[PDB]
Structure formats: structure tokens, C-alpha cells
């Protein structure tokens, strides 16, 4: 209806700025290589030892993240042994592709979501266990990721926060900033705007900062039942815009039998996010049907590997958002170019 009209303006408005400059009149090419903003999907260990969902994911997405692989959990699954090999591996995987690869996690504040031996440990030795794995993790991951999904969750646990205060979680941003100060620090969370927590959200937000802990870029985790609705989304993204810090909406997935509502489901969020000027970002939380942690009622492609009606709105959606054209004046997205010298064209300047 009405909101994708809306939408669409704010895109071209936000996402795209104006070309042929100089560092002419008649007839050139302009193709887009690479794409600023993210278009992204969580990566697991099918990506070791499956070449298919390997070839797909390099196909479909520019960013990507661990759904386990860098979980403190899966790092030491014992205290002291420590392992990073899997995740170094992926890693190099990105790096081959150029895919940047968002951090995540260092820590998770559910108790559901660390490992069970810190679970019966006395507070003091918790944070010995805290202290080595920011600090065993923050280096070896030292200029690796884009971007770190410090700590998880926060309005939904207490297992750090209840045997250290709130003052544990400016300690986790501060000393992250420390050893890797490239990284952007992010707040995740869920129910924000699938739920209407966006108001609790923000003054969370609001809270650490004011503690002095340098969060730096807002993740929403976009975690849907079976409806997506485009305004409320955009509204409840507008309450989190009010803190003049980028979003990302970091691990979206709905869930629905019928391919055509999810289809509808993921053209709500991504478009409507596009649309939104704070929002840098949209990474997808999996995408077969044989590797989806939603089951494959989440999925976009299917287990043998054909799309259905998710997979191939996701894949009309990519190719509007993506500037080809042979014509000396005009509308790209932000990016990379190919004319025909590559060419870059950055959000930096309104042009
Ligand atoms: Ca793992
Ligand atoms: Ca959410």
C-alpha cells in the first residue's frame, strides 16, 4: 500500500547518490561490483564441508556471522581448553570472498546461553573465566571482525549483571575498546521490533552509556513469528533512531508454512529497513532449509537447494537495489562501480 511508497523514496533518497565526477556526456556503463549497505546471513559449519551451501551463501550475501562458532561456549567447552579453529577457519573463508564478518559473541547475558561450567563457579572465579575470555578472544580476534556483538541480550538475562551489577557491563565495553578499538561495539537484543520492547531497549541503551560504556551501533535481532508488519517496524526502528547511533538488524528470520507469507515477510523488514536512514545493515539469521535453527519453515531456499517464493523475492529484491545501467548523470547506490576503471562511491558526502 502506502508504506512502500514511502519506502521506496527514503530508499533512492538514503541509499543512493549521484555519479559521473572526476579524480564525458555520451555513452558509458555503470555496473555495481559491490554493495555498501549489508546484505548479510549468519554462516554455520555446513559452510566446512558443503560446497553447495557454500557456493550460495558467496552468491547471495556480502556479510556474514557465526551462528556458533565464536559463542564462548564453542571456544572453551571446558575451562582452559580453549579452541578457536573452526571459527579461524570461517574467517578465511570470508576473507577469501571479501565478506566482512560481524563478531559475535563475547558474552551473552542468559545464563541459558554459557557454558555449563561457569555455572557453578563462585563470582570471583566467574570473572577470572570473564577476564581471559574478553581478553584470550579480544586478541585473537584482534582486527578481524567489523564489528562485535560485545554482549547479548542484557534485557532479557542477568547471569553477569546479577553477581556483578551493571558495572560488569560498562567493564565488557571498555576493555573490548581497549585491545581492538577498530571494532564497532554493539548492543544486541531481541523482541524490539518484532515485540514492542523498543522503549525499554532505548533507555537501556541510554543506561550503559551514561555508565560510560562506549556502545557504539544498536543491534536488533529481527526474530519473527509469522507476521512482519512494515510500519510498526519502522515506527519502533524510529524510537531506537532517536539516539544518533547506527542499527543493524542483525539475525532476521520469520516463520511460516507458506512460502508466499514469508516472501511477504522478509519484503516487509528488508524493505522497510532499507528504507530507514538509520538502519546500515540487514544480516539474514540462516537460509537452507537443511541448516535453518528455525526449522525449515524459516527458510528461503529449499533442502534440495531450489528456491521457493522467499529465496526468489530475496533475490528480485537484490537485483532492484542494484544499479546497472549503460547510458552522464546518475542515481547509484552506494558501492562499488565498475564503468566501462573501478570506482568507489561511499556514503561520506550527500555529493
Ligand atoms: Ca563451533
Ligand atoms: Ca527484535
Given at each position: 500500500?502506502?508504506?512502500?511508497?514511502?519506502?521506496?523514496?527514503?530508499?533512492?533518497?538514503?541509499r543512493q547518490?549521484?555519479?559521473?565526477?572526476?579524480?564525458?556526456?555520451?555513452?558509458?556503463?555503470?555496473?555495481?561490483?559491490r554493495?555498501?549497505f549489508?546484505?548479510?546471513?549468519?554462516?554455520?559449519?555446513?559452510?566446512?564441508?558443503?560446497?553447495?551451501?557454500?557456493?550460495?551463501?558467496?552468491?547471495?550475501?556480502?556479510?556474514?556471522?557465526?551462528?556458533?562458532?565464536?559463542?564462548?561456549?564453542?571456544?572453551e567447552?571446558e575451562?582452559?581448553?580453549?579452541?578457536?579453529?573452526?571459527?579461524?577457519?570461517?574467517?578465511?573463508?570470508?576473507?577469501?570472498?571479501?565478506?566482512?564478518?560481524?563478531?559475535?559473541?563475547?558474552?551473552?547475558?542468559?545464563?541459558?546461553?554459557?557454558?555449563?561450567?561457569?555455572?557453578?563457579?563462585?563470582?570471583?572465579?566467574?570473572?577470572?573465566?570473564?577476564?581471559?575470555?574478553?581478553?584470550?578472544?579480544?586478541?585473537?580476534?584482534?582486527?578481524?571482525?567489523?564489528?562485535?556483538?560485545?554482549?547479548?541480550?542484557?534485557?532479557?538475562?542477568?547471569?553477569?549483571?546479577?553477581?556483578?551489577?551493571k558495572?560488569?557491563?560498562?567493564?565488557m565495553?571498555?576493555?573490548?575498546?581497549?585491545?581492538?578499538?577498530?571494532?564497532?561495539?554493539?548492543?544486541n537484543?531481541?523482541?524490539?521490533?518484532?515485540?514492542?520492547?523498543?522503549?525499554?531497549?532505548?533507555?537501556?541503551?541510554?543506561?550503559?552509556?551514561?555508565?560510560?560504556?562506549?556502545?557504539?551501533?544498536?543491534?536488533?535481532?529481527?526474530?519473527?513469528?509469522?507476521?512482519?508488519?512494515?510500519?510498526?517496524?519502522k515506527?519502533?526502528?524510529?524510537?531506537?533512531?532517536?539516539?544518533?547511533?547506527?542499527?543493524?538488524?542483525?539475525?532476521?528470520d520469520?516463520?511460516?508454512?507458506?512460502?508466499?507469507r514469508?516472501?511477504?515477510?522478509?519484503?516487509?523488514?528488508?524493505?522497510?529497513?532499507?528504507?530507514?536512514?538509520?538502519?546500515?545493515?540487514?544480516?539474514?539469521?540462516?537460509?537452507?532449509?537443511?541448516?535453518?535453527?528455525?526449522?525449515?519453515?524459516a527458510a528461503i531456499?529449499?533442502?534440495?537447494?531450489?528456491?521457493?517464493?522467499?529465496?526468489?523475492?530475496?533475490?528480485?529484491?537484490?537485483?532492484?537495489w542494484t544499479?546497472?545501467?549503460?547510458?552522464?548523470?546518475c542515481?547509484?547506490?552506494?558501492?562499488?562501480?565498475?564503468?566501462?576503471?573501478?570506482?568507489?562511491?561511499?556514503?561520506?558526502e550527500?555529493?
Amino acid at each position: 500500500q502506502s508504506w512502500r511508497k514511502e519506502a521506496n523514496d527514503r530508499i533512492l533518497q538514503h541509499r543512493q547518490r549521484e555519479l559521473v565526477i572526476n579524480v564525458a556526456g555520451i555513452e558509458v556503463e555503470i555496473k555495481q561490483i559491490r554493495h555498501e549497505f549489508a546484505f548479510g546471513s549468519a554462516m554455520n559449519d555446513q559452510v566446512l564441508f558443503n560446497q553447495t551451501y557454500a557456493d550460495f551463501f558467496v552468491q547471495h550475501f556480502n556479510w556474514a556471522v557465526f551462528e556458533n562458532e565464536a559463542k564462548w561456549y564453542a571456544n572453551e567447552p571446558e575451562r582452559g581448553k580453549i579452541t578457536y579453529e573452526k571459527a579461524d577457519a570461517m574467517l578465511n573463508f570470508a576473507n577469501r570472498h571479501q565478506i566482512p564478518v560481524r563478531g559475535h559473541a563475547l558474552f551473552w547475558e542468559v545464563e541459558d546461553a554459557n557454558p555449563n561450567w561457569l555455572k557453578s563457579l563462585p563470582n570471583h572465579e566467574v570473572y577470572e573465566a570473564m577476564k581471559r575470555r574478553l581478553e584470550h578472544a579480544g586478541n585473537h580476534f584482534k582486527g578481524k571482525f567489523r564489528h562485535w556483538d560485545v554482549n547479548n541480550a542484557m534485557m532479557h538475562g542477568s547471569f553477569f549483571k546479577d553477581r556483578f551489577g551493571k558495572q560488569i557491563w560498562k567493564w565488557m565495553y571498555e576493555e573490548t575498546k581497549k585491545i581492538d578499538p577498530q571494532a564497532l561495539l554493539f548492543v544486541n537484543d531481541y523482541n524490539v521490533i518484532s515485540y514492542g520492547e523498543h522503549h525499554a531497549y532505548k533507555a537501556h541503551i541510554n543506561e550503559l552509556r551514561q555508565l560510560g560504556a562506549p556502545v557504539e551501533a544498536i543491534g536488533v535481532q529481527g526474530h519473527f513469528a509469522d507476521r512482519v508488519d512494515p510500519v510498526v517496524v519502522k515506527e519502533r526502528l524510529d524510537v531506537l533512531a532517536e539516539l544518533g547511533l547506527p542499527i543493524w538488524v542483525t539475525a532476521y528470520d520469520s516463520v511460516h508454512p507458506d512460502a508466499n507469507r514469508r516472501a511477504d515477510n522478509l519484503e516487509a523488514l528488508y524493505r522497510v529497513a532499507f528504507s530507514h536512514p538509520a538502519v546500515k545493515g540487514v544480516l539474514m539469521w540462516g537460509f537452507w532449509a537443511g541448516a535453518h535453527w528455525r526449522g525449515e519453515h524459516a527458510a528461503i531456499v529449499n533442502h534440495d537447494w531450489s528456491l521457493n517464493e522467499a529465496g526468489r523475492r530475496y533475490e528480485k529484491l537484490l537485483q532492484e537495489w542494484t544499479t546497472q545501467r549503460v547510458e552522464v548523470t546518475c542515481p547509484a547506490f552506494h558501492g562499488t562501480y565498475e564503468v566501462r576503471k573501478m570506482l568507489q562511491q561511499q556514503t561520506i558526502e550527500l555529493d
